[PDB]
Design a protein around this ligand. Structure first.
Ligand code: SF4
Ligand code: SF4
Ligand code: FCO
Ligand SMILES: [Fe+2]
Ligand code: NI
Ligand SMILES: [S]
Ligand SMILES: [S]
Lengths: 279, 482
């Protein structure tokens, strides 16, 4: 079928969301780009550049008004009139992240806030920051923009959470139309905007080391893999994600096996999950 | 012909937010300014935290090179805490980080740079593009480049599996901490790493290194531009023993045709043309301060301007390969002769002018990837399955430490000062900071700004060589600004 147009806008992100997506196994990223979506603007990978890239996005946005998907990576900084994040320049005017979200946000079918920065503020909004880093849903709501937002958090997210949420939404739309399908998607979001297929279960309650936790057998050094990791700082008890069975990077490891969970998908990450290495 | 001024924002197929503005007169760039347009302020966010948190927080500077920040951070913490990393943990760290060099260089050549020379499939994000893109390859060779782009997507993913085997996940490893590495390699997982490594090696040797020389041979004019200052920095990386003296890349500075030793006390960061408070200019990183001033008149970037004893230097694979002068790969020796008529044994046999060029930086990155294969092979023979990789040091109340390494894009240091058992100051001087910075307080340009001088623009409506030059440096503005 006709792949939906997608614009990927980076605010105060580290490109970790894009990189994690490149690690998708099935479908592979090539299959995603050639068969699932039409990635019309993405500054890290697209052929064109500068004002021509911006104008191309604007022309697609006009043609597919109300029908494109807007992926936002990173937070949106509102201090200094938006000047802490300039994303382009066209017709001799700079375009801040604030401007871009106000421009495209109202005309998207849906906004996918990928990563904890976009979803909840994340590291750029943490204590000691001064840019006014703002979560996507808050920014849009504060500005009266009603477009639905789906949060796919993690720092970074697992690629399956990103691709799987896209697939779930496109399936819903195929069977119910755009408005009907987005209604069905919103129904499977938790109170933090996260799809329950990936974020509906707690790490610790499903952790393979829960027997050791219950027995009080705690590792005193990171390299002791027999004990529970709680005393080393594991935040699994306060974290909702499926890493305990999904694992990472083709199933080769995950955070709790290797070290500790730092609660990277949670709205209070990082400050509410810090210090990372003590309980 | 007269002047045309060209602004490119966003520069694409780099990481992060960059504007480039060039003045073109009579068909060549005669002036340039680079502007990093996004700021987060990690140096202030970090203050007041448990110092151990830094080795997680700092990775979020950049999701392409997080293992480099992880490494610089844990080395800084190792020093500040007095952590004595076990030998096996040193080797494990090298296996984690080394695998991301492979990932990053392959990502950079194929998924960022190759479209500079190759026309992709006729669908977004490969179209639309400049109508006169100067894509010179035959239909067959172009198709080979596309096929390799697609294969490289799998190869770079396999590299991240290698990182994650002992690093936990990638991006953003969990496996490096102060005191070493959190997971002892088992025999089974070393076999898994080695099996993946074999596939990556085959791709590097059979596809990647050959294609860079082959494409380069169709763009020989691109070795004749982009020299800039011909000045380079390497701070050392990848310790090969626990002495602290033998490293895969040894440190050195190269400028005005001369090799010199690296003394980190000579680094100062200037801000006249950067959006930071004027009173913070000229500080060594041990006294560094980060006070944003986005309304400061005359400034044009969130990147500070690092200078080495007043010198504007570049960093990255070319810098390291020039400073260290390793033997060239067998592929490179053969294709330099057959496709270029060049007899070369060691990297410097390319000559200063061809090495410090647009295409030379791509060649250096490919050669460095080959060089890293041999290092990883050695570490796989050196590691001992089952031997402990970490110590558990107490957090000091008062301490300072500096960690130096080479990120895939160039020299990286982190400095930490601890007071009352919390971060009092944390200063980062990163690779793309050295490359993509603005003018210093005396008006001397940054390395890429200077390397843009002389770039040909025969068609102002299709000024493709401007961003081609920038991309040869593999910029990462997230790293540059932090
Ligand atoms: S604290 Fe962490 S390691 Fe221990 S049982 Fe819970 S999730 Fe698992
Ligand atoms: S285990 Fe915890 S820190 Fe790791 S990816 Fe899952 S939620 Fe994030
Ligand atoms: N590689 C990398 Fe990132 C940059 N520039 C760092 O340091
Ligand atoms: Fe810095
Ligand atoms: Ni980086
Ligand atoms: S990077
Ligand atoms: S890295």
């Amino acid at each position: 079928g006709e792949r939906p147009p997608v614009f990927w806008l980076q605010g105060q992100g580290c490109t970790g969301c894009s990189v994690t997506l490149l690690n998708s196994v099935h479908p592979s990223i090539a299959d995603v780009l050639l068969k699932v979506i039409s990635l019309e603007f993405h500054p890290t990978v697209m052929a064109w550049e500068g004002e021509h890239a911006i104008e191309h996005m604007r022309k697609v946005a006009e043609k597919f008004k109300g029908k494109f998907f807007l992926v936002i990576e990173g937070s949106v900084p509102v201090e200094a009139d938006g000047k802490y994040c300039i994303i382009g320049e066209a017709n001799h005017h700079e375009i801040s992240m604030v401007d871009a979200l106000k421009e495209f946000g109202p005309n998207a079918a849906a906004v996918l806030a990928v990563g904890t920065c976009a979803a909840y503020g994340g590291i750029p909004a943490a204590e000691g920051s001064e840019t006014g880093a703002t979560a996507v849903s808050k920014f849009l709501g504060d500005n009266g923009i009603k477009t639905p937002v789906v949060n796919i958090p993690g720092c970074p997210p697992h690629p399956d959470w990103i691709v799987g949420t896209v697939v779930l939404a496109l399936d819903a739309i195929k069977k119910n139309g755009l408005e009907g399908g987005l209604a069905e998607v919103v129904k499977v979001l938790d109170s933090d905007g996260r799809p329950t297929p990936f974020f509906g279960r707690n790490i610790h309650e499903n952790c393979p080391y829960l027997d050791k936790y219950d027995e009080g057998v705690m590792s005193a050094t990171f390299t002791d893999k027999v004990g529970c990791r709680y005393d080393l700082g594991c935040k699994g008890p306060m974290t909702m994600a499926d890493c305990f069975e999904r694992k990472w990077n083709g199933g080769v490891n995950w955070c709790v096996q290797n070290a500790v969970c730092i609660g990277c998908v949670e709205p209070d990450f990082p400050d509410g999950k810090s210090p990372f290495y003590q309980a | 012909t007269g002047r045309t001024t060209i602004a490119i924002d966003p520069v694409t197929r780099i990481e992060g937010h960059l504007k480039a503005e060039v003045v073109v007169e009579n068909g060549k760039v005669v002036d340039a300014r680079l502007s990093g347009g996004m700021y987060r302020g990690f140096e202030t966010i970090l203050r007041g935290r448990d110092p151990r948190d830094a080795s997680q927080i700092v990775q979020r500077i950049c999701g392409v090179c997080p293992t480099a920040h992880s490494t610089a951070s844990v080395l800084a913490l190792d020093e500040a805490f007095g952590a004595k990393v076990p030998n096996n943990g040193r080797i494990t760290r090298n296996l984690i980080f080394g695998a991301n060099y492979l990932q990053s260089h392959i990502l950079h050549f194929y998924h960022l740079s190759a479209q500079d020379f190759v026309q992709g499939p006729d669908t977004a994000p490969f179209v639309p593009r400049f109508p006169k893109s100067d894509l010179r390859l035959s239909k067959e060779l172009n198709k080979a480049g596309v096929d390799q782009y697609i294969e490289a997507l799998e190869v770079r993913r396999i590299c991240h599996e290698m990182v994650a085997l002992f690093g936990g996940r990638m991006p953003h490893v969990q496996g490096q901490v102060v005191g070493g590495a959190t997971e002892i390699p088992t025999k089974e997982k070393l076999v898994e790493y080695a099996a993946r490594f074999k596939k990556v090696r085959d791709f590097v040797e059979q596809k990647y290194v050959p294609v860079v020389y082959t494409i380069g041979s169709k763009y020989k004019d691109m070795f004749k531009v982009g020299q800039g200052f011909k000045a380079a920095l390497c701070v050392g990386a990848f310790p090969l023993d626990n002495s602290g003296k033998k490293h895969l890349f040894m440190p050195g500075v190269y400028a005005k045709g001369k090799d010199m030793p690296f003394d980190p006390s000579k680094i100062k960061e200037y801000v006249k043309y950067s959006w930071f408070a004027e009173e913070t200019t000229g500080l060594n990183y041990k006294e560094g301060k980060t006070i944003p001033a986005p309304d400061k008149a005359g400034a044009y970037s969130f990147v500070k301007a690092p200078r080495y004893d007043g010198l504007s230097l570049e960093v990255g694979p070319l810098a390291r390969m020039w400073v260290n002068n390793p033997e060239l790969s067998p592929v490179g020796k053969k294709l330099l002769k057959d496709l270029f008529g060049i007899s070369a044994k060691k990297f410097r046999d390319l000559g200063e002018e061809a090495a410090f060029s647009l295409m030379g930086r791509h060649v250096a990155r490919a050669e460095e990837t080959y060089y890293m294969l041999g290092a990883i092979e050695g570490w796989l023979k050196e590691i001992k399955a089952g031997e402990d990789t970490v110590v558990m040091p107490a957090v000091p109340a008062s301490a300072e430490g500096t960690g130096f390494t080479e990120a895939p894009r160039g020299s990286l240091l982190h400095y930490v000062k601890v007071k009352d058992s919390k971060i009092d100051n944390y200063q980062i001087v990163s690779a793309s900071l050295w490359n993509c910075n603005p003018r210093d307080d005396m008006g001397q340009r940054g390395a890429v700004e200077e390397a843009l001088i002389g770039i040909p623009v025969d068609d102002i409506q299709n000024p493709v060589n401007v961003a081609r030059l920038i991309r040869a440096f593999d910029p990462x503005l997230a790293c540059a600004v932090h």
